[PDB]
């Protein structure tokens with residue numbers, strides 16, 4: 727293309743995603759094509775040829791459509807984002823004077839499954855399972871901890887924190903989970 731824009735987009739699982747075809751509206755478009763390359767699947771397209779008003783789709787059963795709009799804007803829509811929607815979304819606009827391309831690296835935000843519990847010998851476990859990206863785990867009060875981060879095949883990350891407190895005056899502890907989808911302070915009785 728004569729101008730290529732590459733960007734990353736993060737959208738929360740289950741939400742609706744709207745992607746603009748280019749950084750600016752392009753008036754003299756003769757052809758608009760979205761090429762969707764999903765993780766482990768053949769590519770499909772949604773296209774619009776301007777002169778004949780010929781709309782196209784080879785994305786049946788992929789839940790990817792043009793956005794519904796009165797002015798027929800070349801915006802792509804994902805009505806309910808699944809982890810499977812991760813991939814490259816490329817919009818190609820042909821104008822008489824040149825090609826414009828916008829490539830989206832679409833990333834899905836996944837709230838972690840949080841489990842927390844006391845363990846034997848004044849210990850506590852706090853785990854943020856299969857979050858995307860990794861959650862962060864901190865504690866109140868600070869303890870002697872071992873925290874691991876395990877990434878899975880799906881791209882989600884399990885963060886597991888196991889602590890012990892050598893201050894016998896401490897009876898209640900709080901696990902603080904931070905994530906792009908949400909944050910929470912979680913109490914544990916030792």
Ligand SMILES: *[C@@H]1O[C@H](CO)[C@@H](O)[C@H](O)[C@H]1NC(C)=O
Nearest residue numbers: 730731732814816829830831
């Ligand atoms: C932009 O993204 C495309 C598709 O993901 C890639 O092929 C291309 O190399 C990237 N451009 C640059 C300048 O890195």
Ligand SMILES: *[C@@H]1O[C@H](CO)[C@@H](O)[C@H](O)[C@H]1NC(C)=O
Nearest residue numbers: 774781792793794798799800
């Ligand atoms: C293609 O058709 C859909 C409805 O099936 C419409 O929402 C969309 O605007 C059309 N595409 C373009 C760019 O006109």
Ligand SMILES: *[C@@H]1O[C@H](CO)[C@@H](O)[C@H](O)[C@H]1NC(C)=O
Nearest residue numbers: 809855856878879880881882
């Ligand atoms: C991978 O992702 C799914 C969500 O799509 C999650 O529920 C699951 O726990 C993850 N897989 C493993 C083996 O952890």
